[PDB]
Design a protein around this nucleic acid. Structure first.
Ligand SMILES: [Ca+2]
Lengths: 61, 96, 97
DNA sequence: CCATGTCAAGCACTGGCGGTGATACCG
DNA sequence: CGGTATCACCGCCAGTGCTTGACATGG
């Protein structure tokens, strides 16, 4: 939870927010790339891009 | 606007050889332009610009790419390989 | 958007070590910032900037300096020399064709 | 079929690499 | 004077952030 929340603190709030939404942590649903896209005003591919960068970010430290 | 200046023919040949190695080995090495980029500290489009002869290789990126692809720099750019050798001569403390 | 980025502490040291090597050997080698710039294809403000810590060294200019000054790169920048050797491993390893 | 995810290529945009060059200053 | 110091100025492109078109696939 908090160890998680502070663990998602090395990324931009946007990268973090992309992950939380993908994993259902914000509202209970595991949103699709398109849904997160529409949230951020960009395509599903750019969300894919961001998510990957974020995962690689927390899997190196 | 203001299109990017074309690289030299030799640079373009370097890149074509680079990309061809990439295409030939990506499946077995399990790479994507994206995963390669990450190993290099950069983004996918940046690596792509290098593979497609749009952005110039430097010695650092060439070496990085050679290590990732498991080939010698000599396999895509002889001139960058010679440049690196030239620089290596300079770490040699030599005799008395 | 500052056009110039400041050097890290390590880059400043490399510069100091570089400069000191210039000061110590300029006489035996008949060098001036100016003559050194000429060997490197730049201007004397160019060299001054490298000797004074205004512009960071890169691998190529470090290798050149080392060759002009007759020392090995690692006598002024051990990190740049490490970078050089690592790059050369990529020329050595995994040959085919 | 096609929603979902993946890959590669193209382009507007910019940080900062990598210098330039008077000219004034030092020993 | 031979050298050095910095001011004082910046072109340019390598890499970014995003898109688009093609494509693979479990359901
Ligand atoms: Ca030059």
């Amino acid at each position: 939870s908090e160890e998680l929340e502070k663990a998602l603190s090395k990324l931009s709030e946007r990268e973090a927010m992309v992950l939380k939404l993908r994993k259902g942590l914000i509202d209970g649903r595991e949103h699709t790339l398109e849904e997160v896209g529409a949230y951020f005003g960009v395509t599903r591919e750019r969300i894919r891009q961001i998510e990957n960068k974020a995962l690689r970010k927390l899997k190196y430290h | 606007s203001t299109k990017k200046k074309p690289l030299t023919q030799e640079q373009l040949e370097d890149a074509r050889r680079l990309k061809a190695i990439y295409e030939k080995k990506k499946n077995e090495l399990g790479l994507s332009q994206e995963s390669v980029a990450d190993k290099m500290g950069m983004g996918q489009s940046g690596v792509g610009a290098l593979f497609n002869g749009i952005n110039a290789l430097n010695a650092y990126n060439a070496a990085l790419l050679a290590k990732i692809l498991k080939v010698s720099v000599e396999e895509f750019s002889p001139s960058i390989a010679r440049e690196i050798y030239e620089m290596y001569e300079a770490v040699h403390h030599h005799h008395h």
